[PDB]
């Protein structure tokens, strides 16, 4: 009862404020102007937007994942709760992007994604690191869903770096500080499995404490064990969807695991054959143009007799991960071995290191201010 005394009092206070949101932003200049003046912080005004991003999503996820029939939650929020706030004229501040990226978050859990186009187009206001890191969060996830593994893996690198010149300080990632650490860790780990004999960019993204364990995971996954298919997929699911609260686990109510059938089994199909793409590339491409010695050496390696070695070989070259040609008279297999790049880290660091100098020189000149 204490459970749904808290839950219901969030939504009823948000439904209250939703009317104030629509009322102030659009037309009442003097009410906005009166609100600019009185406090020393306009931070109180702005926080309440994306504070209610993740708290409302929690409360609606509970009501979603308790009532699976005669749907009250999902059409009320979708119609009224979300579109009224966002579709109409933005408040003049970062609040226009806050309500945008609150809506982008709400739009992310729903698996209907195609208006990521126009959400970026309506992000007219400048990309502050606060708004930008949370844009690249979802935009990278959108590329992860687009099967643009090579694009998304770069986008996850920057947001996990912790020299995007974040400083926070006053609770703008609060109570989920390490979610940004572990979700970017996790979703980057899936992308490394698909392609990698290219980056050589994983050094920047993830630190060696985790690179060591996730490194051996990919190898153990693709080569010799489907065990990593399990444990990777266990950690990947809470982070792929982001279901903010799983409901109280008990057998007396059912009510909760039924949505989790869909939610989970939706992502089963993702990692299923995308993982089995990996093992083909896993065997290093030892000799770039393969004669009879190496082509048969690789067709001994693909699968054994008899039936249907060549067919399966020529099915898998198509996907994205080989570029090659067949010759008839020679009987020769000629192929493409492409590689990435060595050092791209140093020249990106040359500014980052100078920020270690800068905020060094600056913070002590704030202490040199005080004790002088």
């Amino acid at each position: 009862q204490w459970l749904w005394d808290i839950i219901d009092e969030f939504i009823y206070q948000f439904q209250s404020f939703s009317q104030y949101r629509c009322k102030t932003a659009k037309k009442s200049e003097e009410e906005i102007d009166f609100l600019r003046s009185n406090p020393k912080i306009w931070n109180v005004h702005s926080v309440l937007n994306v504070l209610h991003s993740l708290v409302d999503k929690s409360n609606i996820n509970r009501q979603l994942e308790v009532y699976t029939s005669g749907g009250d939650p999902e059409s009320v929020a979708g119609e009224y709760g979300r579109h009224s706030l966002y579709k109409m004229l933005g408040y003049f501040s970062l609040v226009g992007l806050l309500r945008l990226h609150s809506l982008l978050g709400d739009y992310y859990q729903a698996i209907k994604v195609l208006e990521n186009i126009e959400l970026n187009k309506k992000s007219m206001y400048s990309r502050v690191p606060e708004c930008q890191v949370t844009t690249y969060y979802y935009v990278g996830f959108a590329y992860l869903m687009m099967r643009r593994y090579q694009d998304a893996i770069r986008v996850f690198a920057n947001i996990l770096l912790y020299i995007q010149r974040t400083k926070s300080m006053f609770q703008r990632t609060t109570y989920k500080y390490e979610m940004i650490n572990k979700q970017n860790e996790q979703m980057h780990a899936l992308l490394a499995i698909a392609l990698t004999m290219y980056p050589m960019r994983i050094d920047e993204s993830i630190h060696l404490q985790l690179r060591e364990k996730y490194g051996d995971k990919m190898l153990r996954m693709q080569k010799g064990d489907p065990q990593v298919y399990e444990e990777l997929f266990s950690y990947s699911c809470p982070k792929f969807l982001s279901p903010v609260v799983p409901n109280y686990d008990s057998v007396h109510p059912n009510y909760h695991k039924e949505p989790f059938l869909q939610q989970l089994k939706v992502f089963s199909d993702e990692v299923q054959q995308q993982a089995q793409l990996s093992t083909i590339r896993s065997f290093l491409k030892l000799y770039t143009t393969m004669p009879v010695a190496k082509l048969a050496g690789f067709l001994d390696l693909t699968e054994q007799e008899f039936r249907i070695q060549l067919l399966v070989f020529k099915h898998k070259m198509k996907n994205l991960v080989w570029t090659s040609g067949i010759s008839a008279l020679d009987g020769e297999f000629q192929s493409a071995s492409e590689v990435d790049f060595y050092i791209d880290k140093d020249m990106i660091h040359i500014a980052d290191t100078k920020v270690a100098r800068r905020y060094g020189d600056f913070f002590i000149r704030q202490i040199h201010k005080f004790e002088e």
């Binding site: 698996i111 208006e115 869909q262 067919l311 198509k318 040609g325 493409a336 790049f341």
Partner: protein, 215 residues
């Protein structure tokens, strides 16, 4: 030409609050068939019907989802068909004709084109009933041939396209300008034109790095 007469209407439907209202399925399920029959496409209208079907599983209609699924598979290697299974329920992937359509879809992603045309059942008149579908999948076969072959044998390219005859293959030969070579393969692409490496070449980033190191 009913596709062109619903674009403006359905465009404002799918940007409003009518894409989480189930009542709009009248105009929307009609417009889904208008894609399939008239050989046109709109991902958003499909995905909204799929989302409204995911909302209330009872309103799911098998043929309307087949008209989504089949036309998703014409548009590969895009993630249109990825977004289909994401909204289609556990119950709803075991329906007819859905189960056969999904299985055939799996073959196209893993690019088992030989197995695709073997797998076909020819008594399902719905798969004949989608206009330009039989050629669309063939155009996607030849699309990926161009990306990852430098040559292909005449018998080989035939078999991938459903065991074509000599005369049937003349269309596909002419389509991307492909032509015969000595003994006796069909040319697809030049060897240096297919590979396209963008590998080792950087460390030419002097200008920016000196502009920031200027002071």
């Amino acid at each position: 030409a009913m596709f062109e007469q619903m674009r403006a209407n359905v465009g404002k439907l799918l940007k409003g609050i009518d894409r989480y209202n189930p009542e709009n399925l009248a105009t929307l399920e009609r417009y889904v068939e208008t894609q399939a029959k008239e050989n046109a496409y709109d991902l958003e209208a499909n995905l909204a019907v799929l989302k409204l079907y995911q909302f209330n599983p009872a309103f799911f209609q098998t043929t309307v989802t087949a008209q989504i699924l089949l036309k998703a598979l014409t548009n590969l290697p895009h993630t249109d068909f990825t977004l289909c299974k994401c909204m289609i329920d556990q119950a709803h992937q075991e329906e007819r004709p859905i189960r056969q359509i999904l299985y055939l879809g799996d073959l196209l992603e893993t690019c088992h084109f030989q197995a695709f045309w073997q797998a076909l059942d020819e008594n399902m008149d719905l798969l004949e009933g989608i206009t330009g579908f039989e050629d669309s999948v063939r155009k996607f076969i030849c699309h990926v041939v161009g990306i990852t072959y430098q040559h292909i044998d005449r018998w080989l390219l035939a078999e991938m396209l459903g065991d074509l005859t000599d005369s049937q293959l003349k269309m596909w030969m002419s389509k991307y300008g492909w032509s015969a070579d000595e003994s006796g393969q069909i040319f697809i692409c030049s060897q240096e034109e297919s590979i396209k490496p963008k590998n080792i070449v950087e460390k030419i980033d002097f200008d920016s790095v000196s502009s920031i190191m200027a002071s």
